[PDB]
Amino acid sequence: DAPQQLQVPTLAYDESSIVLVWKAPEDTRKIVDYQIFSAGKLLGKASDNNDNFSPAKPYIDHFYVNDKDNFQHKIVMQNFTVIGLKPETSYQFTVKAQYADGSLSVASKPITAKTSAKPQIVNVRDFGAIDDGKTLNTKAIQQAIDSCKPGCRVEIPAGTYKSGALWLKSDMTLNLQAGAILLGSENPDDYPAGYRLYPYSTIERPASLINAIDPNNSKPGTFRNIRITGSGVIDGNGWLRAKTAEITDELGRSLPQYVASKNSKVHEDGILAKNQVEKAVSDGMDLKNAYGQRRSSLMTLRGVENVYLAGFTVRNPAFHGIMNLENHNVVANGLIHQTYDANNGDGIEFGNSQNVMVFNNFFDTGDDCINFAAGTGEKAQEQEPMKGAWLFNNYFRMGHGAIVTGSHTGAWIEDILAENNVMYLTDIGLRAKSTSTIGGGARNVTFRNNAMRDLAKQVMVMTLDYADSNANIDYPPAKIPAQFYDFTLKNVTVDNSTGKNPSIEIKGDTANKAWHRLVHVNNVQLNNVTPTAISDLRDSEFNKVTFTELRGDTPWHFSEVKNVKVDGKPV
Ligand SMILES: O=C(O)[C@H]1O[C@H](O[C@@H]2[C@H](O)[C@@H](O)[C@@H](O)O[C@@H]2C(=O)O)[C@H](O)[C@@H](O)[C@H]1O
Numbered sequence: 027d028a029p030q031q032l033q034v035p036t037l038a039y040d041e042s043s044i045v046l047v048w049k050a051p052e053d054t055r056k057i058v059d060y061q062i063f064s065a066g067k068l069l070g071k072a073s074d075n076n077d078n079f080s081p082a083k084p085y086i087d088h089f090y091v092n093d094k095d096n097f098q099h100k101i102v103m104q105n106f107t108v109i110g111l112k113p114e115t116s117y118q119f120t121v122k123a124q125y126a127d128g129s130l131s132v133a134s135k136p137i138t139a140k141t142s143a144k145p146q147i148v149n150v151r152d153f154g155a156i157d158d159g160k161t162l163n164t165k166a167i168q169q170a171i172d173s174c175k176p177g178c179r180v181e182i183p184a185g186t187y188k189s190g191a192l193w194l195k196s197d198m199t200l201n202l203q204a205g206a207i208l209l210g211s212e213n214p215d216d217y218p219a220g221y222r223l224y225p226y227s228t229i230e231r232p233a234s235l236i237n238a239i240d241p242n243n244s245k246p247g248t249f250r251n252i253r254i255t256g257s258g259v260i261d262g263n264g265w266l267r268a269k270t271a272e273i274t275d276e277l278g279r280s281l282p283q284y285v286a287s288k289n290s291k292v293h294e295d296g297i298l299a300k301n302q303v304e305k306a307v308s309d310g311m312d313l314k315n316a317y318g319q320r321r322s323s324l325m326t327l328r329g330v331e332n333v334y335l336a337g338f339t340v341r342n343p344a345f346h347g348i349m350n351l352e353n354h355n356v357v358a359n360g361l362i363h364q365t366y367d368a369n370n371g372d373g374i375e376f377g378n379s380q381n382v383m384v385f386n387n388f389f390d391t392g393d394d395c396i397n398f399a400a401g402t403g404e405k406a407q408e409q410e411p412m413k414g415a416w417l418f419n420n421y422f423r424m425g426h427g428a429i430v431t432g433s434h435t436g437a438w439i440e441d442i443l444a445e446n447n448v449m450y451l452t453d454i455g456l457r458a459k460s461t462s463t464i465g466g467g468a469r470n471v472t473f474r475n476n477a478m479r480d481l482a483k484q485v486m487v488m489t490l491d492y493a494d495s496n497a498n499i500d501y502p503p504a505k506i507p508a509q510f511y512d513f514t515l516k517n518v519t520v521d522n523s524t525g526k527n528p529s530i531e532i533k534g535d536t537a538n539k540a541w542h543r544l545v546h547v548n549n550v551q552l553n554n555v556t557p558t559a560i561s562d563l564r565d566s567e568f569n570k571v572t573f574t575e576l577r578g579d580t581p582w583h584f585s586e587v588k589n590v591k592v593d594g595k596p597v
């Protein structure tokens with residue numbers, strides 16, 4: 027049976043290279059690889075291609091080095107990067123599944139894809155940007171982006187260029203080259219007023235280091251075709267290093283460690299974050315709000331139609347990492363997030379966005395690795411639901427949760443597929459959080475074909491915390507309350523969870539009609555984890571969930587359930 031949906035991810039192409047992706051099926055037990063052909067001639071194998079181009083892949087391979095007795099689910103590759111092409115040329119492509127026994131499947135349906143024309147190179151050094159400093163390069167870099175024809179590529183060569191908020195525009199690529207560091211200014215003045223998160227958000231936030239923000243409007247299409255690429259670094263300049271400032275990782279590579287702070291300690295821990303909180307407070311804000319709203323995130327792209335992020339490293343954000351607000355057709359390919367343990371420094375936020383994709387990423391983050399947000403309370407539907415996410419071939423290291431949906435569940439989070447990922451040391455695999463006042467919820471979320479080791483807290487959580495009035499709400503409360511339903515956990519193995527809360531933990535408020543429903547759990551193996559705690563669940567089943575070395579006497583703990591089923595045999 028042929029591979030489905032070979033495709034080029036949005037803007038995932040160049041004058042000399044094209045990126046291909048495709049669907050792997052639910053059951054990959056017999057598929058050990060995929061092979062890629064242009065005009066019926068072999069280009070190579072997905073596995074070996076990923077060894078060359080994916081930053082996640084050496085980590086994914088090493089993950090299995092420990093794995094005797096073959097306990098861990100073996101993921102398959104779903105991407106292949108075709109390089110060494112010529113400008114403006116059409117190429118045809120097919121993909122075949124390769125099986126354990128050496129045989130291939132029938133070829134996929136073909137795709138034709140054309141490279142782009144060689145772009146107008148614009149170098150920021152030609153506008154007076156210089157690696158020192160203290161040359162603040164905001165003006166040079168902005169000058170370079172301003173002087174940009176549609177289809178340009180702005181280059182930031184090797185060197186450390188301090189800069190304040192920059193403002194991107196449609197039909198461009200910003201390329202950070204090997205050895206380039208875009209360093210955030212620590213001056214709160216270089217980040218002028220930026221955006222409000224939601225239409226009903228009352229506190230204005232400053233600009234991020236990199237922006238695509240229309241001063242008036244969030245509507246998808248406000249910008250179009252924005253690309254940020256290259257193996258260079260974006261450094262937010264937010265925080266001091268931790269007591270132990272660098273660790274050696276499991277591949278023996280060096281990881282930066284950023285201090286873990288709070289609102290009352292930012293005066294000690296921050297750099298950009300110190301200065302922005304101090305400025306906000308002298309201007310009249312209390313600390314709580316100054317810390318929560320007034321630190322610059324690393325990147326905020328809003329209203330963009332077609333985004334492509336690739337190759338770059340993220341370090342040291344003053345607030346959040348990468349933010350996508352009201353975007354369509356976003357792709358994140360092979361980013362390296364090194365922001366542990368920057369307070370609220372999540373890897374990528376997806377907010378009221380549609381059709382998004384993250385693959386080949388390395389995540390080591392101060393907060394959630396991938397977060398999905400859809401607004402909060404009654405006013406939420408003024409905006410699109412967060413609809414359509416595909417998260418594959420990533421390596422999650424530390425962070426508050428690999429896949430997080432999201433607490434902000436207002437306009438609905440939906441159609442989310444997380445497959446063929448590896449998690450090592452992450453807090454949680456799948457984290458679904460809301461309250462009854464936020465409303466909305468998450469639905470049609472699939473978490474499958476993932477392998478996980480040494481989770482710090484839990485395998486899956488779905489909490490729903492009913493409030494209500496009990497009036498403490500910053501937005502209008504929700505009339506129709508929040509709910510999680512239609513969640514699938516399938517073909518997932520966890521070895522070790524070193525926390526103490528339940529391995530699988532579902533909690534609503536059934537007293538107050540707040541329950542989760544339609545949870546389908548199939549073929550999961552959990553070694554050395556605590557027992558489950560599942561309350562307020564309906565119409566759900568748990569089949570072939572095997573607990574070995576359980577840290578407790580019995581795996582299954584059920585209160586307040588209706589119509590579930592273990593194996594399937596019932597309560
Ligand atoms: O307010 C924001 O900018 C964010 O709110 C929600 O995240 C909260 C934290 O800022 C986040 O880093 C982590 O601690 O979780 C929090 C929560 O969910 O309550 C959204 O989930 C974020 O995407 C963002 O909008």
Ligand code: NI
Pocket residue numbers: 088091276
């Ligand atoms: Ni090792």
Ligand code: NI
Pocket residue numbers: 261341342
């Ligand atoms: Ni640093």
Ligand code: NI
Pocket residue numbers: 367368391392393425426
């Ligand atoms: Ni953290």
Ligand code: NI
Pocket residue numbers: 393426
């Ligand atoms: Ni948190």
